[PDB]
Design a protein that fits this description.
Layout (H helix, E strand, L loop, with lengths): L1 E2 L8 H11 L2 E5 L7 E4 L2 H9 L3 E2 L10 H5 L7 H14 L2 H20 L7 E2 H6 L1 H11 L6 H13 L6 H20 L5 H7 L10 H15 L1 H16 L1 H9 L4 H12 L8 E3 L3 E3 L2 E3 L4 E4 L1 H5 L37 H18 L4 E2 L21 E3 L2
Parallel strand pairs: 1-2, 3-9
Antiparallel strand pairs: 2-3, 4-6, 5-11, 6-9, 7-8, 10-11
Helix pairs in contact: 4-10, 5-7, 5-16, 7-8, 7-11, 8-9, 9-11, 12-14, 12-16, 14-16
The structure holds protoporphyrin IX containing FE and calcium ion.
Protein name: Cytochrome P450 hydroxylase sb21
Family: Belongs to the cytochrome P450 family.
InterPro entries: Cyt_P450, Cyt_P450_B, Cyt_P450_CS, Cyt_P450_sf
């Protein structure tokens, strides 16, 4: 009764909100459906689904030599295997590291912004939103500065090559990380790669080299395009909302709350990967059967009027306390985004940077003319043309 392609893609906000209201647990129909898929759209039900341990991400619960790096990543694991990797990665990817990243993200962002020209239209997606978060992950991980252009190029190729060729930069990145790990282990420094290498549980358990390569690749893949589109989408939102933008410039302490609202209103991830029922589960007055799939819809949860009053309004002041996170744009439960604090920091830094350097920052086309890169479960611009001066 629900089919995923037609004009849902163009307006997922109205499309999934109508569904939320009329059919809060609905069947979704996709070609090659190896099971029934249940679409879950209410805020409370999306949190129920994402917090439920009976839902698993792997139904079990590129050369052949590279396959592991793409299949055993943290988001693909459940139960005890997940518990272990999450515990291990949390010993290295710490609060201290995130706090210490702030001035580094400020310097990186500033150097990018400072090189942008005033004498032509600037594409903020290609020229800033994409290079920043890959560079930030380079800095976090400790990729040698000399090789950051190479990493940005691999990142750019991952987004722009055909799907028959997208493997090449992935494999090259793997090879790079494989080579770098023993170097960093022989020459340790205060960076996240060292942190990962040296992390160990109190009983001695620790990452294998395979797991270290997989984890590094995961952070890049999970953190590059997502963060890019938070920056692009949030900037476009601000530049089309002059009253909210003026408030934000007048009250820059609003930035953390402003980022929460931009995530709720136009965050780039609109659905999570499919969950599978490990056993029968009662959910909002029905029963999901063992083996059936469930797709949590973040965008409809984040626009749910049961939770957010006038949810269609972009209100940067909506949440009073920048410490509270009410939206599900970073997910929920055991797979809640590992990078959320870093991503929110990149957003705060990016939006503050843009506003501070460019009082005359403005869109260079009417918003109806922006091109969305249509893509399942995503909300992303193809480009963001602006004038800086
Ligand atoms: C800053 C860099 C980022 C890194 C390093 C990062 C890393 C990750 C990782 C490793 C996971 C999987 C964790 C697990 O399975 O236990 C994850 C999940 C997730 N992240 Fe991120 N992330 C980043 C940015 C973002 C951004 C900007 C968004 C959204 C706009 C986002 C949304 C998500 C969501 C929704 C999940 C959960 C997926 C699910 O349950 O299916 N992340 N993140
Ligand atoms: Ca995407």
């Amino acid at each position: 009764v629900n089919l995923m392609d037609p004009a849902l893609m163009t307006d997922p906000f109205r499309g999934f909100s109508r569904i939320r209201e009329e059919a809060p647990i609905a069947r979704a129909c996709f070609p090659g459906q190896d099971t029934p898929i249940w679409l879950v759209t209410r805020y409370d039900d999306v949190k129920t689904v994402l917090g439920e341990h009976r839902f698993v991400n792997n139904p079990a619960s590129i050369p052949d030599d590279y396959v592991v790096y793409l299949t055993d990543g943290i988001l693909d694991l459940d139960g005890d295997d997940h518990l272990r990797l999450r515990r291990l990665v949390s010993r290295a990817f710490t609060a201290r590291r995130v706090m210490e990243m702030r001035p580094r993200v400020e310097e990186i962002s500033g150097r990018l912004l400072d090189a942008l020209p005033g004498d032509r239209v600037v594409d903020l997606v290609e020229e800033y939103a994409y290079p920043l978060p890959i560079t930030v992950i380079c800095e976090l991980v400790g990729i040698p500065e000399s090789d950051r252009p190479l990493w940005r190029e691999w990142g750019a190729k991952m987004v722009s090559l055909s799907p028959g060729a997208m493997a090449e930069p992935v494999i090259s990145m793997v090879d790079y990380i494989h080579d770098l790990i023993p170097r960093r282990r022989a020459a340790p420094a205060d960076d996240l790669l060292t942190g990962l290498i040296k992390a160990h549980d109190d009983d001695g358990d620790r990452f294998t080299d395979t797991e270290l390569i997989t984890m590094v690749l995961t952070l890049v893949l999970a953190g590059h395009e997502t963060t890019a589109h938070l920056i692009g989408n949030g900037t476009a939102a601000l530049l089309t909302h002059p009253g909210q933008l003026a408030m934000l410039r007048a009250r820059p302490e609003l930035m953390p709350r402003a980022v929460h609202e931009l995530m709720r209103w136009c965050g780039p991830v609109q659905g999570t990967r499919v969950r599978y029922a490990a056993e029968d589960v009662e959910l909002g007055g029905m029963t999901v059967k063992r083996g059936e799939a469930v797709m949590a819809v973040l965008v409809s949860a984040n626009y749910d009027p049961r939770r957010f009053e006038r949810p269609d309004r972009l209100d940067l002041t909506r949440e009073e306390d920048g410490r509270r996170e009410v939206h599900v744009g970073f997910g929920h439960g055991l797979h809640y985004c590992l990078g959320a604090a870093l991503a929110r920091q990149e957003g705060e830094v990016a939006f503050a940077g843009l506003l501070s350097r460019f009082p005359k920052l403005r869109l260079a086309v009417a918003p109806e003319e922006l091109e969305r890169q249509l893509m399942p479960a995503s909300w992303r611009l193809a480009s963001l043309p602006v004038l800086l001066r």
